[PDB]
């Protein structure tokens with residue numbers, strides 16, 4: 001599955017593929033862009049089958065419903081929603097276009113990389129654990145981005161030797177997605193990514 005979107009401030013591409021032969025995807029995503037801001041999230045439910053999907057889908061629904069809140073607040077709602085569920089790893093990104101500012105919060109192994117034309121990268125390390133409903137050691141990042149910056153959020157089904165280099169080389173989200181095709185073919189898991197190129 002691919003979805004492409006564009007407005008004055010961002011071009012995005014979402015890609016999602018189930019593990020081959022698997023009908024029920026355990027990953028979820030949400031994305032909404034308007035003229036002022038972007039919110040997106042990617043989640044990977046623990047375990048297998050419908051129960052993994054239940055966990056990541058609940059995150060998708062909460063991010064959509066609570067999009068207006070700070071990422072810190074949204075991720076806490078998501079944690080609380082994981083009580084009595086499988087749990088999920090998840091990352092949430094909000095971007096304010098006029099300010100060229102982003103805010104990012106994550107628990108678990110969903111990765112985020114933002115590359116700026118100047119060579120500046122933001123590539124935070126994963127926080128261990130997962131959203132479980134138990135207390136978390138949350139870490140939020142707020143930073144400015146420069147025009148031309150490109151980013152990816154991806155689940156652990158995407159196995160790529162050097163993702164920063166793909167963001168640097170590719171000049172559009174389509175080019176970057178095409179350069180990743182050879183790694184999507186070798187997946188052993190559900191694979192979801194969101195690419196963006198910021199004006």
Ligand SMILES: [Mg+2]
Pocket residue numbers: 044155156157189190
């Ligand atoms: Mg996975």
